Short mmCIF file of C-alpha atoms in Angstrom, two decimals:
data_model
loop_
_atom_site.label_atom_id
_atom_site.label_comp_id
_atom_site.label_asym_id
_atom_site.label_seq_id
_atom_site.Cartn_x
_atom_site.Cartn_y
_atom_site.Cartn_z
CA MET A 1 28.51 81.39 53.44
CA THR A 2 24.82 81.26 53.96
CA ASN A 3 22.19 84.23 54.30
CA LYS A 4 22.00 83.84 58.15
CA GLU A 5 25.87 83.90 57.96
CA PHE A 6 25.90 86.51 55.74
CA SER A 7 23.71 88.84 58.12
CA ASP A 8 25.68 87.74 61.16
CA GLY A 9 29.11 88.84 59.95
CA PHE A 10 27.71 91.98 58.53
CA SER A 11 26.58 92.81 61.99
CA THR A 12 29.83 91.58 63.36
CA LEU A 13 31.84 93.65 61.31
CA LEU A 14 29.59 96.55 61.54
CA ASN A 15 29.74 96.64 65.34
CA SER A 16 26.26 96.54 65.47
CA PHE A 17 24.66 97.26 69.25
CA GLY A 18 28.46 97.60 70.65
CA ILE A 19 29.06 100.47 73.29
CA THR A 20 30.97 102.22 70.68
CA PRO A 21 29.10 104.51 67.96
CA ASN A 22 28.06 101.96 65.12
CA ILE A 23 25.87 101.32 62.35
CA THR A 24 22.54 99.25 62.40
CA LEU A 25 21.13 98.08 59.00
CA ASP A 26 17.70 96.52 58.23
CA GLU A 27 17.57 93.10 56.20
CA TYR A 28 16.69 94.92 53.30
CA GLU A 29 19.82 97.51 53.53
CA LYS A 30 21.87 94.39 53.98
CA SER A 31 20.56 92.88 50.94
CA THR A 32 20.96 95.98 49.00
CA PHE A 33 24.53 96.70 49.71
CA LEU A 34 25.29 93.18 49.55
CA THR A 35 23.83 93.13 45.73
CA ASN A 36 25.28 96.17 45.30
CA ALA A 37 28.92 95.10 46.36
CA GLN A 38 28.25 91.73 44.39
CA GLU A 39 27.71 93.12 40.89
CA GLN A 40 30.35 95.83 41.34
CA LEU A 41 32.86 93.50 42.48
CA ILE A 42 32.14 91.19 39.45
CA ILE A 43 32.09 94.01 36.83
CA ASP A 44 35.44 95.48 38.22
CA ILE A 45 36.80 91.86 38.07
CA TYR A 46 35.65 91.16 34.50
CA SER A 47 37.22 94.55 33.31
CA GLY A 48 40.34 93.63 35.26
CA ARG A 49 39.79 97.16 37.04
CA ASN A 50 40.05 96.11 40.69
CA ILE A 51 43.23 97.48 41.82
CA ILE A 52 43.38 94.40 44.24
CA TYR A 53 43.35 91.47 41.66
CA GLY A 54 44.21 93.67 38.64
CA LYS A 55 43.04 90.63 36.83
CA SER A 56 40.68 89.90 34.01
CA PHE A 57 37.75 87.49 33.37
CA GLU A 58 39.68 84.24 32.94
CA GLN A 59 43.32 85.51 33.44
CA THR A 60 44.20 83.41 36.62
CA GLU A 61 43.10 80.42 38.22
CA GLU A 62 41.65 82.64 41.24
CA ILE A 63 39.34 84.58 38.78
CA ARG A 64 38.09 81.57 37.27
CA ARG A 65 37.14 80.31 40.62
CA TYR A 66 35.40 83.61 41.33
CA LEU A 67 33.09 83.95 38.25
CA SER A 68 33.05 80.23 37.27
CA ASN A 69 29.06 80.51 38.41
CA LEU A 70 28.14 82.90 35.86
CA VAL A 71 29.20 81.43 32.74
CA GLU A 72 26.27 80.13 30.79
CA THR A 73 26.12 78.62 27.47
CA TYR A 74 23.20 79.05 24.89
CA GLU A 75 22.20 77.87 21.51
CA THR A 76 19.74 79.15 19.25
CA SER A 77 18.62 78.33 15.34
CA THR A 78 15.62 80.98 15.32
CA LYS A 79 16.41 83.82 13.25
CA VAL A 80 14.31 87.34 13.41
CA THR A 81 12.55 87.88 10.26
CA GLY A 82 11.63 91.66 10.15
CA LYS A 83 14.46 93.94 10.80
CA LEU A 84 16.46 96.46 8.57
CA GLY A 85 20.29 95.91 8.42
CA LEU A 86 23.67 97.09 7.04
CA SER A 87 23.80 94.22 4.29
CA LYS A 88 21.79 92.08 2.42
CA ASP A 89 23.37 88.79 4.10
CA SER A 90 22.47 89.58 7.61
CA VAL A 91 20.57 87.66 9.81
CA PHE A 92 19.42 88.73 13.42
CA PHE A 93 19.19 86.62 16.37
CA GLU A 94 17.75 87.01 19.95
CA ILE A 95 20.14 87.25 22.83
CA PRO A 96 19.05 85.33 26.07
CA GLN A 97 18.21 88.86 27.86
CA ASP A 98 19.86 87.81 30.94
CA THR A 99 23.62 88.32 29.39
CA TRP A 100 26.08 90.61 31.12
CA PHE A 101 28.99 90.09 28.70
CA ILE A 102 29.36 87.87 25.50
CA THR A 103 32.77 86.08 26.25
CA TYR A 104 32.56 82.99 23.75
CA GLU A 105 30.51 83.42 20.50
CA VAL A 106 30.69 81.08 17.72
CA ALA A 107 28.25 80.10 14.35
CA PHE A 108 27.65 76.92 12.63
CA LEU A 109 27.11 77.41 8.81
CA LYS A 110 24.89 75.29 6.63
CA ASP A 111 25.17 76.08 2.78
CA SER A 112 25.87 74.30 -0.44
CA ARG A 113 28.52 76.60 -1.47
CA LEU A 114 31.25 75.35 0.58
CA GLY A 115 31.17 72.18 -0.48
CA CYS A 116 32.38 69.25 1.73
CA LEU A 117 33.04 71.54 4.50
CA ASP A 118 29.17 71.61 5.29
CA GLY A 119 28.56 72.16 9.09
CA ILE A 120 31.56 74.41 9.62
CA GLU A 121 31.99 76.36 12.94
CA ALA A 122 32.70 80.03 12.16
CA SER A 123 34.36 82.48 14.74
CA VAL A 124 32.00 85.46 15.43
CA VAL A 125 34.25 88.54 14.90
CA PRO A 126 32.52 91.48 17.16
CA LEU A 127 33.25 94.33 14.63
CA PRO A 128 32.89 98.00 15.44
CA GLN A 129 30.73 100.25 12.76
CA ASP A 130 33.81 102.34 11.36
CA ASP A 131 35.28 98.89 10.18
CA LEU A 132 32.30 97.72 8.67
CA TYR A 133 32.24 99.18 5.05
CA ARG A 134 36.02 98.60 4.77
CA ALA A 135 35.78 94.98 6.28
CA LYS A 136 32.78 93.77 4.08
CA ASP A 137 34.98 93.28 1.22
CA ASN A 138 38.34 92.51 3.32
CA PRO A 139 38.90 88.74 2.20
CA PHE A 140 41.27 88.66 5.77
CA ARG A 141 39.04 90.33 8.46
CA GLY A 142 35.56 90.44 6.65
CA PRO A 143 32.76 87.71 6.26
CA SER A 144 34.14 84.23 5.09
CA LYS A 145 33.67 80.53 5.68
CA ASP A 146 35.90 80.85 8.67
CA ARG A 147 34.66 83.96 10.07
CA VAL A 148 31.48 86.03 10.87
CA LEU A 149 30.85 89.68 11.72
CA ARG A 150 28.42 90.48 14.83
CA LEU A 151 26.96 93.44 15.08
CA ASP A 152 24.91 94.69 18.27
CA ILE A 153 21.70 96.07 17.65
CA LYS A 154 18.62 97.47 19.88
CA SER A 155 16.07 95.03 21.37
CA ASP A 156 18.71 92.59 22.39
CA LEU A 157 19.66 91.58 19.09
CA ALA A 158 23.10 90.36 17.12
CA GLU A 159 23.12 91.42 13.52
CA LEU A 160 25.18 88.31 11.88
CA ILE A 161 26.83 89.34 8.54
CA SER A 162 28.07 86.37 6.87
CA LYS A 163 29.07 85.20 3.29
CA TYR A 164 27.28 81.93 3.83
CA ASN A 165 23.93 80.73 5.41
CA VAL A 166 23.92 80.71 9.37
CA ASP A 167 22.01 78.04 10.48
CA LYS A 168 23.14 77.77 14.37
CA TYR A 169 24.26 80.51 16.94
CA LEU A 170 26.08 79.69 19.74
CA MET A 171 27.16 81.71 22.88
CA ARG A 172 29.14 81.47 26.35
CA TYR A 173 28.26 84.62 28.27
CA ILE A 174 28.24 85.78 31.92
CA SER A 175 24.82 85.77 33.35
CA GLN A 176 23.01 88.10 35.79
CA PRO A 177 23.93 86.93 39.21
CA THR A 178 21.27 85.96 41.46
CA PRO A 179 20.78 88.78 44.03
CA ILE A 180 21.69 88.43 47.63
CA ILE A 181 18.60 88.62 49.46
CA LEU A 182 18.58 87.91 53.19
CA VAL A 183 14.85 87.84 53.76
CA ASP A 184 11.33 87.48 52.21
CA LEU A 185 10.94 90.65 51.63
CA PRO A 186 7.55 92.39 51.77
CA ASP A 187 4.95 93.09 48.85
CA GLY A 188 6.26 95.86 46.71
CA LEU A 189 9.73 95.28 47.56
CA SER A 190 12.21 93.22 45.38
CA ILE A 191 16.00 93.42 44.21
CA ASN A 192 16.57 92.82 40.42
CA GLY A 193 13.06 91.72 40.50
CA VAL A 194 13.19 89.21 43.15
CA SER A 195 11.09 89.20 46.30
CA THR A 196 12.19 85.79 48.13
CA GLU A 197 15.36 84.94 49.69
CA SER A 198 18.41 84.50 47.07
CA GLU A 199 21.02 82.92 47.91
CA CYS A 200 24.92 84.11 46.33
CA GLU A 201 25.49 81.62 43.74
CA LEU A 202 29.18 82.26 43.34
CA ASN A 203 31.77 80.56 45.32
CA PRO A 204 32.73 80.78 49.27
CA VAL A 205 35.88 82.41 48.31
CA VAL A 206 34.32 85.86 46.89
CA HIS A 207 31.76 85.88 49.77
CA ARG A 208 33.66 87.50 52.25
CA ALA A 209 35.26 89.94 49.56
CA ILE A 210 31.72 90.78 48.94
CA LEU A 211 30.74 91.30 52.45
CA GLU A 212 33.76 93.46 52.95
CA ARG A 213 32.96 95.86 50.04
CA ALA A 214 29.24 95.69 51.25
CA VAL A 215 30.36 97.00 54.70
CA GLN A 216 32.61 99.84 53.06
CA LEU A 217 29.35 100.70 50.95
CA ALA A 218 27.51 100.97 54.04
CA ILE A 219 29.68 103.07 55.81
CA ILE A 220 29.92 105.34 52.82
CA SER A 221 26.36 105.59 52.65
CA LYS A 222 26.01 106.89 56.26
CA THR A 223 28.91 108.99 56.16
CA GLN A 224 28.69 111.12 52.90
CA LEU A 225 27.19 114.13 54.54
CA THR A 226 28.77 114.24 57.72
CA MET B 1 30.88 101.06 122.43
CA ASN B 2 28.04 99.06 124.03
CA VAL B 3 24.80 100.16 124.21
CA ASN B 4 24.78 101.56 127.81
CA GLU B 5 27.50 104.13 126.50
CA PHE B 6 25.48 104.94 123.50
CA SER B 7 22.56 106.44 125.60
CA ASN B 8 25.32 107.84 128.22
CA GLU B 9 27.32 109.71 125.47
CA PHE B 10 23.96 110.54 123.60
CA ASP B 11 22.44 112.20 126.67
CA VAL B 12 25.91 114.09 127.09
CA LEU B 13 25.95 115.26 123.68
CA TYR B 14 22.65 115.84 123.43
CA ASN B 15 21.04 117.71 126.81
CA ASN B 16 23.35 117.61 129.74
CA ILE B 17 25.68 120.31 128.49
CA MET B 18 22.85 122.69 126.51
CA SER B 19 22.21 125.84 128.18
CA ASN B 20 18.62 125.49 128.15
CA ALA B 21 18.17 122.07 128.47
CA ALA B 22 15.61 119.98 126.50
CA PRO B 23 13.59 117.27 127.70
CA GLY B 24 15.73 113.88 128.15
CA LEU B 25 14.55 111.45 125.30
CA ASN B 26 13.28 107.90 126.19
CA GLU B 27 14.91 104.95 125.46
CA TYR B 28 12.88 103.94 122.60
CA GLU B 29 13.31 107.24 121.18
CA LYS B 30 17.17 106.94 121.63
CA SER B 31 17.15 103.12 120.16
CA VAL B 32 14.68 104.25 117.29
CA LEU B 33 17.26 107.50 116.41
CA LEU B 34 20.44 105.61 116.86
CA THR B 35 19.13 102.78 114.37
CA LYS B 36 18.19 105.48 111.75
CA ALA B 37 21.54 106.79 112.10
CA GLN B 38 23.00 103.59 111.56
CA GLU B 39 21.30 102.76 108.04
CA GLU B 40 22.11 106.65 107.14
CA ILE B 41 25.84 105.98 107.78
CA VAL B 42 25.78 102.91 106.07
CA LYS B 43 24.19 104.32 102.54
CA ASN B 44 26.15 107.61 103.18
CA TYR B 45 29.71 105.48 102.94
CA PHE B 46 28.67 103.11 100.57
CA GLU B 47 28.07 105.48 97.74
CA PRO B 48 31.17 108.06 97.03
CA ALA B 49 28.63 110.96 96.22
CA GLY B 50 26.80 110.38 99.76
CA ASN B 51 29.65 111.73 101.78
CA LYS B 52 31.62 114.68 101.78
CA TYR B 53 34.95 112.95 100.75
CA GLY B 54 33.67 111.57 97.66
CA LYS B 55 34.72 108.22 98.71
CA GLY B 56 32.70 104.75 98.38
CA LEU B 57 32.90 101.34 99.58
CA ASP B 58 36.63 100.36 98.69
CA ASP B 59 37.97 103.64 98.19
CA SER B 60 40.09 104.13 101.19
CA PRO B 61 41.55 101.92 104.26
CA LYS B 62 38.89 103.87 106.43
CA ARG B 63 35.68 102.67 104.30
CA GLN B 64 37.24 99.09 104.09
CA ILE B 65 37.30 98.95 107.91
CA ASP B 66 33.74 100.46 108.12
CA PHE B 67 32.25 97.63 106.07
CA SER B 68 34.64 95.02 107.42
CA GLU B 69 32.33 93.95 110.40
CA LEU B 70 29.23 93.72 107.59
CA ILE B 71 30.31 91.95 104.80
CA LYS B 72 28.82 88.30 104.41
CA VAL B 73 29.54 85.56 102.17
CA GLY B 74 26.33 83.19 100.83
CA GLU B 75 25.08 81.01 98.58
CA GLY B 76 22.12 81.27 96.40
CA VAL B 77 19.45 78.09 96.53
CA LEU B 78 18.44 77.13 93.09
CA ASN B 79 14.59 77.73 93.03
CA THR B 80 13.32 74.55 91.53
CA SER B 81 11.02 74.18 94.61
CA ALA B 82 8.39 75.55 92.72
CA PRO B 83 7.90 76.56 89.07
CA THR B 84 7.78 80.18 87.74
CA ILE B 85 7.81 82.75 84.67
CA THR B 86 11.43 83.36 83.96
CA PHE B 87 11.84 86.32 81.38
CA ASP B 88 14.43 84.24 79.66
CA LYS B 89 14.17 80.73 78.69
CA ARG B 90 17.79 79.63 79.36
CA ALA B 91 18.10 81.32 82.92
CA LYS B 92 18.08 79.68 85.97
CA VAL B 93 16.60 81.20 89.21
CA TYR B 94 18.46 81.27 92.31
CA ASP B 95 17.25 83.19 95.70
CA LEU B 96 19.57 84.95 97.60
CA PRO B 97 19.68 85.28 101.26
CA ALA B 98 17.36 86.98 103.12
CA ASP B 99 19.44 89.27 105.25
CA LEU B 100 21.00 90.94 102.19
CA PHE B 101 21.23 94.82 102.19
CA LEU B 102 23.87 95.26 99.19
CA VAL B 103 25.34 92.90 96.91
CA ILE B 104 29.26 93.95 95.89
CA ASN B 105 30.46 90.59 94.52
CA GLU B 106 29.02 87.39 92.73
CA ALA B 107 30.33 84.67 91.00
CA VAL B 108 29.04 81.30 89.45
CA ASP B 109 31.16 77.87 89.46
CA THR B 110 30.34 76.12 86.52
CA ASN B 111 31.64 72.74 85.02
CA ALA B 112 33.20 75.14 82.60
CA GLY B 113 35.15 77.31 85.65
CA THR B 114 34.30 79.75 87.71
CA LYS B 115 32.88 83.00 86.23
CA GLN B 116 32.09 86.33 87.47
CA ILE B 117 28.48 87.51 87.31
CA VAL B 118 27.93 91.14 85.55
CA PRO B 119 24.58 92.59 86.69
CA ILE B 120 23.29 94.03 83.45
CA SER B 121 21.09 96.72 83.04
CA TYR B 122 17.62 96.38 81.21
CA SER B 123 18.98 98.80 78.64
CA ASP B 124 22.15 96.62 78.32
CA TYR B 125 19.93 93.42 78.22
CA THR B 126 18.04 94.65 75.31
CA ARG B 127 21.05 96.05 73.73
CA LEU B 128 22.79 92.75 74.25
CA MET B 129 19.98 90.38 72.89
CA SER B 130 19.77 92.38 69.88
CA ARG B 131 23.04 91.01 68.99
CA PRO B 132 23.37 87.32 66.95
CA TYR B 133 25.41 85.84 69.90
CA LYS B 134 23.73 87.07 73.00
CA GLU B 135 25.92 85.05 75.61
CA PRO B 136 28.48 86.28 78.42
CA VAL B 137 32.16 86.80 77.41
CA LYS B 138 34.52 84.21 78.34
CA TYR B 139 34.74 84.63 82.01
CA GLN B 140 31.76 85.94 82.75
CA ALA B 141 28.04 85.68 83.49
CA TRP B 142 24.94 87.75 83.64
CA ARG B 143 22.46 88.57 86.04
CA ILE B 144 18.85 90.14 86.04
CA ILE B 145 16.47 90.28 88.77
CA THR B 146 13.04 88.25 88.48
CA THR B 147 9.89 88.11 90.19
CA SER B 148 10.89 88.33 93.93
CA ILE B 149 8.46 87.59 96.90
CA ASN B 150 9.94 87.73 100.32
CA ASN B 151 13.51 87.73 99.06
CA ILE B 152 15.39 88.62 96.16
CA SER B 153 14.87 85.93 93.51
CA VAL B 154 17.67 86.12 90.66
CA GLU B 155 18.22 85.07 86.87
CA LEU B 156 21.67 83.70 86.12
CA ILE B 157 22.36 83.37 82.33
CA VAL B 158 25.23 81.44 81.52
CA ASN B 159 26.73 80.01 78.34
CA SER B 160 25.18 77.22 76.37
CA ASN B 161 25.97 73.74 77.53
CA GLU B 162 27.13 74.99 80.84
CA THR B 163 25.74 73.73 84.40
CA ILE B 164 25.85 75.49 87.52
CA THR B 165 27.20 73.99 90.56
CA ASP B 166 27.50 76.83 93.11
CA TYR B 167 26.54 80.27 93.38
CA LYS B 168 28.37 82.56 95.88
CA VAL B 169 27.13 86.27 96.78
CA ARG B 170 29.41 88.75 98.75
CA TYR B 171 27.28 90.91 100.11
CA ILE B 172 26.74 93.47 102.96
CA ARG B 173 24.23 92.24 105.74
CA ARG B 174 21.54 94.15 106.85
CA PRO B 175 22.56 95.83 110.23
CA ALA B 176 20.82 95.07 113.61
CA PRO B 177 19.19 97.46 115.55
CA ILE B 178 20.75 99.45 118.21
CA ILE B 179 18.51 99.16 120.92
CA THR B 180 19.70 100.04 124.57
CA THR B 181 17.30 98.81 126.91
CA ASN B 182 14.64 95.54 126.98
CA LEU B 183 11.95 97.42 125.05
CA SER B 184 9.46 94.80 126.73
CA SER B 185 6.41 96.44 128.57
CA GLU B 186 3.47 95.51 130.18
CA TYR B 187 1.63 98.16 127.89
CA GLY B 188 2.73 96.94 124.62
CA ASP B 189 5.74 95.19 123.20
CA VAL B 190 7.78 97.90 120.87
CA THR B 191 10.30 96.65 118.40
CA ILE B 192 12.70 98.43 116.01
CA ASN B 193 13.14 95.95 113.60
CA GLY B 194 11.03 93.18 114.71
CA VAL B 195 13.15 92.66 117.90
CA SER B 196 12.73 94.19 121.26
CA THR B 197 15.69 92.75 123.31
CA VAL B 198 19.02 94.39 123.61
CA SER B 199 20.91 94.74 120.68
CA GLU B 200 24.30 95.81 120.30
CA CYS B 201 25.83 97.98 117.20
CA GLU B 202 27.64 94.72 115.63
CA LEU B 203 29.90 97.15 113.28
CA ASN B 204 33.26 97.95 113.70
CA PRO B 205 34.10 100.24 116.83
CA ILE B 206 35.39 103.41 114.01
CA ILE B 207 32.10 104.51 112.89
CA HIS B 208 30.40 104.04 116.54
CA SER B 209 30.76 108.10 116.98
CA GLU B 210 30.02 108.79 113.75
CA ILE B 211 26.47 106.78 114.43
CA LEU B 212 26.23 108.76 117.84
CA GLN B 213 26.78 111.98 116.11
CA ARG B 214 23.97 111.46 113.39
CA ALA B 215 21.55 110.44 116.11
CA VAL B 216 22.07 113.52 117.96
CA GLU B 217 21.72 115.64 114.78
CA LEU B 218 18.59 113.92 114.16
CA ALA B 219 17.37 114.16 117.64
CA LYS B 220 17.49 118.10 117.45
CA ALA B 221 16.28 118.28 114.00
CA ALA B 222 13.33 116.46 115.39
CA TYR B 223 13.37 119.11 118.24
CA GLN B 224 13.06 121.75 116.20
CA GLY B 225 10.52 120.22 114.01
CA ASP B 226 10.29 122.74 111.19
CA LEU B 227 10.07 121.79 107.78
CA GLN B 228 13.40 123.28 106.84
CA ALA B 229 15.25 120.89 109.19
CA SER B 230 13.49 117.98 108.08
CA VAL B 231 14.15 118.50 104.40
CA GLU B 232 17.56 119.70 104.80
CA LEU B 233 18.48 116.32 107.17
CA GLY B 234 16.40 114.14 104.99
CA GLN B 235 18.90 114.82 101.97
CA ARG B 236 21.17 112.53 103.70
CA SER B 237 18.74 109.62 103.80
CA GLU B 238 20.13 108.53 100.21
#
């Protein structure tokens, strides 16, 4: 569905300007509620907390077809120099700053010590800080040629603890979806920092579910004190 | 009840039986009062709240027979004779018949079948055109009155890609006046509604007695001539 179709369906479902009591929204309010419904729905889908679906990020074909258009791949070889880490062999990499959740995260290694295995792809294991001390020396869950520990730190950074030098850092995350903005908003206004029209980038399959959730949010907004 | 009897029983009920007889009325005065009573009774009986029963045009057999001899079916003429400015870019202008008192049924015959015309109010127009679709329901059409000169001009709004072939209006004809005698005179021709000749009551004989009674009441109210009578019997003009 397009922005015009989004607005028209929103009005039709809300029974705007009908004879019965009803609710009429501005295009800014329609955009706000559509964006809120979109982001709520995709977060609930990713966490598997939607009772209707009850499935996780890629647990079935339906959810794949829903959130296929947020999956973005990223590559980086630059390392942030001045930072204080929890180990000597700690390197820091920037995050793209539009990430929502990291779903695939792997690290290529370039070191002489692992001879004839150079350029080995290594599995970045997100490790909590409780386990870090007892995982540094762990030969089965600690850093090694086939495994790297990533700890999240401030300023959108990723502290990669490896026994070998880390050359490249690969990611595949869920991106910020573009907001659903149905009209070029006036000066000052914006949704997610976007002022112009913005079409939903997901598939049309989930557009109608987003519309239903946005409508429900609208009625909740108008009918939370009565 | 032809007009000679209208005058004769008007005299009988007005002054011939009074104890202190009032001056007899001229034939022009009787014609004017009878025509006024005719219009007053038509408006009384068309609207339910205008009469004591609370019954309108088709709320009882009597009202049906009352307006039976006044109903007429005519067609609206497409007003492409001259240009004009319609309030709606997609409305076709049609001119209603001249002798139109009240509209009770309208219909339009399109290529996509016949459709009932729903006269939408100025508030319903604003409500409906604020919606995305802005077209009538399946088997109906909308109507709003436009710039009218010498006769009611009408805008018909149908669904897109529909061409109007006929536009029939079932309306209540304007009653002809009740004139007892030829009002032609050497001192000046007077008219009731632009006609001086004898004019019979062209309505069903069922309401002729009511017209006569209302005429007598108007005559006596005029005879008294105080403000109280005029305002009290002016409430029933309606």
